[PDB]
Design a binder for this molecule. Structure first.
Ligand code: HEM
Ligand code: HEM
Lengths: 145, 145
């Protein structure tokens, strides 16, 4: 369950999430677009869910893609801010899951973001230690899907 | 259309939005819930759109309502951060309007959030000057609905 997954966020895992987000969250537009573009490049099969965004290969030039990428980063900002209170983190995660469930996005499908996240982290000098920490957070969301 | 509304966001308006948000946004859970509950209190009819949240009379204690309230504040955080770049503000506002348009929420209906905002600002001692500034930001969103 999501409640069991949330308990997986140990002291150091939360610390690593904060330290890394401090750098990544500094540039939501740049890192957000890089994250979304990397997802479409590594998993072209997911592009079907974003028909509304149009020509996704335009990247930063695509207004809809840029709007989505920036907004996405604020959802991560939300999760990071709720790390202190497990009860709040959970209600925020379930709230976030509603729309993804409606779009029939499965836990396995959502888990494809781990690759893009690991690469963005690496580009900022954050290794496996941090990629694994973020996979833990992503796992909390997967448990709600 | 959204661009024209964004033009009303003058240097002074953006200054007041940033100063008031520095306080309001410091407690997203507390002020977020205050906003939503005040909306339901002053405009009971808007409750028809939130059947999913369950017993909204529980307020803060309601996990779904608390989860929604907190998340709502991050949309505002998003807008406030994009104030200096009209292009990003516009793409983020249009991205935000997509789901509200699907819910059949007209600009008039959305405008009902102005009252609650004015009251929340007043509780922190922010006069009409700030209430008008925020009414202009909401106007940008209304232009997208
Ligand atoms: C780090 C992970 C992710 C985050 C933080 C995230 C965040 C968001 C946010 C904040 C929205 C806007 C609110 C909403 O409508 O739900 C959204 C929309 C959406 N998400 Fe997710 N999402 C993530 C991963 C994914 C993945 C992996 C898929 C699909 C493979 C997906 C598909 C969608 C779609 C289709 C939309 C609508 C896009 C549009 O039409 O503008 N999301 N997501
Ligand atoms: C400053 C005002 C508002 C902000 C910043 C805001 C923000 C948000 C956000 C971030 C979401 C989650 C993403 C999504 O599903 O779109 C959302 C959901 C929603 N909003 Fe808005 N909203 C505002 C006002 C309103 C108003 C006035 C109504 C209707 C009278 C409305 C109705 C909804 C509904 C029904 C949901 C889904 C709630 C749920 O089932 O969890 N919103 N809004």
């Amino acid at each position: 369950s999501v409640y069991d997954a949330a308990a997986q966020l140990t002291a150091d895992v939360k610390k690593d999430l904060r330290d890394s987000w401090k750098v990544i969250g500094s540039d939501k537009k740049g890192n957000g677009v890089a994250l979304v573009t990397t997802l479409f490049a590594d998993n072209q099969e997911t592009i079907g869910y974003f028909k509304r965004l149009g020509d996704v290969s335009q990247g930063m030039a695509n207004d809809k893609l840029r709007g989505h990428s920036i907004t996405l980063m604020y959802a991560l900002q939300n999760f990071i801010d709720q790390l202190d209170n497990p009860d709040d983190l959970v209600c925020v995660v379930e709230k976030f899951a509603v729309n993804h469930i409606t779009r029939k996005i499965s836990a396995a499908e959502f888990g494809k973001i781990n690759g893009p996240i690991k690469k963005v982290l690496a580009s900022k000098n954050f290794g496996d230690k941090y990629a694994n920490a973020w996979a833990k957070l992503v796992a909390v969301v997967q448990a709600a899907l």
